[model samples]
Target: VNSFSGYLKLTDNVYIKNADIVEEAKKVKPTVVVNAANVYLKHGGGVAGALNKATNNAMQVESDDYIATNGPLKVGGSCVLSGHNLAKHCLHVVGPNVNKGEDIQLLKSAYENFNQHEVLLAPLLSAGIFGADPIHSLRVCVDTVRTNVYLAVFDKNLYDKLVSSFL
Candidate 1:
């Protein structure tokens, strides 16, 4: 039998593979769990014979339902498109489509408004080039926000550049 093997990295640095998400999550024992935003499922919207034909559909996240169901702890899912507020509390941001400036503003606002101690987690520049130039974008974001940010990436080369620019 053909099998796919890969590693799954969580916000808390818990890494597992060939396992279940919930089971792994429980093992990590995180006080709060945050689901990063991305089109986890892709299908129906593209051509029938496309190389990438997705079967599962997109997850639907509702704010009110999330609050009532998850007790304002577990943030994001098939409910909230953005985890702006959750990141301020006991949650982390897990999406890439948003710009760095916009995400920073949202995170800062959430912290200021909600009065909670939490951190934001995101990828490099929302799958886009970090501005016309990488170095400039890093400088602008750091200068404007004036806060420490964390990034998760697999490409070592990119991480090297990020370090060179940020530090």
Candidate 2:
């Protein structure tokens, strides 16, 4: 794996990080890790894909079983599943698509759902293929999370953008 990681204290509890997210997630072993999941909870792209890879697709299998049993997740809703190799639990939430109707509210709700876990490994919700602006999503996450959180990011530009937020 390409190793590159850094951290900044956004608050006494919240932190921003730049690294391979799943790799960092494994290191921190938080109470729960956040996935920018779809309503269907597919582990096809973005962080979900990496998380699935790390778990050898066991997580995807669990997601499928959850959907089969409970139906698709609604926007702003979340479900916790066995984390397999990652942790004991994974909080998967459907992020809002900015191009559609749900905007900042759903994204905030997704971040807010992590409140039950005192520590989090979160992403820039809706900031990837789901189409929300990263900077805005990052701001919302930092503002919304209730405890010690590591906002794991990958792209150099996005990491720098986070740095600029505090400047």
Candidate 3:
């Protein structure tokens, strides 16, 4: 097994990390792996896109059903679906668009709604395709998910930047 692991405390319980999202998810076996999603549940881009593919597109189906019933989800809103990949569950959160300055706040709201799970594995919400700064996005994630949080990063350079900033 890949034993590679590293972590940084954002708070008393929350932690930020740099590792393969799927591998870390398998290691921690978190109750949910939060995906940065669109309100329409397209799951066609960014982390949502990758997660949808990994989950055999089941996450997209569930997300579509939720949208069909609830109408388009608003920014910061979320839905939970059965996990098909390494996760036990998938928390699909509707985040802000690339142009929105409220992306961080919306992300924080998304994390606040995660009361169903004790441990959550999440990417840097809104940091990728949404164009928000990774460091700022992570700060919001840490601020809201005051419990156990595993923040995944795929790039070593980005990971180093995060560690340097925090450490």
Candidate 4:
């Protein structure tokens, strides 16, 4: 049996990689860059900014157009933006503000919305600054996107926890 550093196979299609998301994502081209974002699609920072920065700030324009034409992205929903300069598309999913509402269903829907993607360079949605539990959020992402996927993990402690928990 063979294994690669930072990569853990959850299934034939699902993978978890403990590393910098932007750096790892840069290596894999022609894939959607799915990310947890705000309702306004503001990429001030976080995974949102990293994804946008990778695109030379083109994401802000597309995000503006998307909101102007389709309205702000609602919680538990998503909108795909084009011309990421590196990715095939950017799937922006709105994670629920768990501090206000610990809405697991909302988070589930957010994950479910991206099941159509073949390969996704994404973080654990609804977790971290969004305040959702890593343990719960990982399962939602794993369970929802049964399609091919990749999870880019930045926190080693959380990654360790996930590995221990999953095993």
Candidate 5:
């Protein structure tokens, strides 16, 4: 189930650069690294099954913890963090069937401690976990992430450049 059709590039922005993220992490000298990804789950069914499969395949033990969301969990805004004796940590983010543009803030907030660390492991499938047409889901996932990061990079000029380029 974890396997998908072709490669799913998690973050849409070509500028974000997955290789650079890994390279940056390598420079940090972390004792372990966890690849955080997005998993699409619903009330009756969730990613626990796939994660369990991953644990079994990797020969790693497993544990579970829960948090009380004040309200209904919003897709693309929900996240869970877990750690293991074997790996650094795993962050599971949930994305909706479509983009809501909330993932950007969630990711940025998660990396508030970026200065203390060098690398971040983001699985390409994180934001595209929803069951949708592969290309459509991929485009929406990438576009949202890219637009978010582009806003950060250009900040005040984001709107001006976006309009000029797309309009």
Candidate 6:
């Protein structure tokens, strides 16, 4: 299995690590995991797509119901999906899409909304497929969360870039 190759502490509790996203989820065993979904709750690509596959697409059905009731989610808005495989709960948020200069702030807001827990697993929000700069997005996540945050990295190329950028 892919273990975390390296880690950087954003704070005493929060960390950014280069590791396989799925492996990290299973290894960390956090109370909650964050999913980078669209306003429509579609898990088409990136971390959201990985989560959807991991959960056997079960979260999507519930996510759809949630969206139907709550209407389209705002950038920082979120909903929870329970009994997911990787974590007891999954926080689904409408991440910022392409060309939104405010994507970084919105990403921080989305992470800020997470309930305090001992450990929370999340990807570099809006960094992939959503078109936000990964380094900036990751920094926002670190700056926003109050407790332990494990940032999962799925791509080695991107991971290397992040490490270089941070250095």
Superposition TM-score, candidate 6 onto the true structure: 0.84
Give TM-scores for every candidate, taking all chains together and pairing residue i with residue i.
0.33, 0.89, 0.84, 0.88, 0.37, 0.84
Best candidate (score: lDDT): 2
List candidate 5 stretches off by more than 4 Å.
1-48, 56-64, 68-72, 83-87, 97-129, 146-167
- Cα RMSDs of all predictions? 11.3, 3.6, 3.1, 2.8, 11.6, 3.3
> How far in Å is the alpha carbon of 5 misplaced in model 2?
8.5
- How much lDDT does each candidate structure score? 0.30, 0.79, 0.74, 0.78, 0.32, 0.73
Which residue pairs show collisions in model 1? Answer: 36-94, 37-94, 60-78, 61-78, 61-79, 62-79
Per residue, candidate 1 scores C-alpha lDDT tens digits across 39-125 of 332212211111111111212333334445555331111222332222222232322234343343332222221113232232332
Mind sharing the TM-score for model 2?
0.89
Model 1 residue 60 CA deviation in Å: 4.1
Query: What value of lDDT does candidate 4 attain over all alpha carbons?
Result: 0.78
Stretch of 10 with least lDDT, candidate 1: 46-55
Decide which is better by lDDT, 2 or 6: 2
Spell out the clash pairs found in candidate 2: none
Give per-residue CA lDDT, model 5, range 105-161, as digits (tens): 344333332223333333333222334333332334344443222111112243233
**Model 2, C-alpha of 112: deviation from truth (Å):** 1.3
Candidate 4 off by > 4 Å? 1-6
Using lDDT as the measure, name the better of candidate 4 and candidate 5. Answer: 4
| Backbone clashes (count) for model 1 | 6
Alpha carbon lDDT of residue 112, candidate 6? 74
Candidate 1 off by > 4 Å: 1-118, 126-133, 165-167
Give the Å shift of residue 22 in candidate 3: 2.8
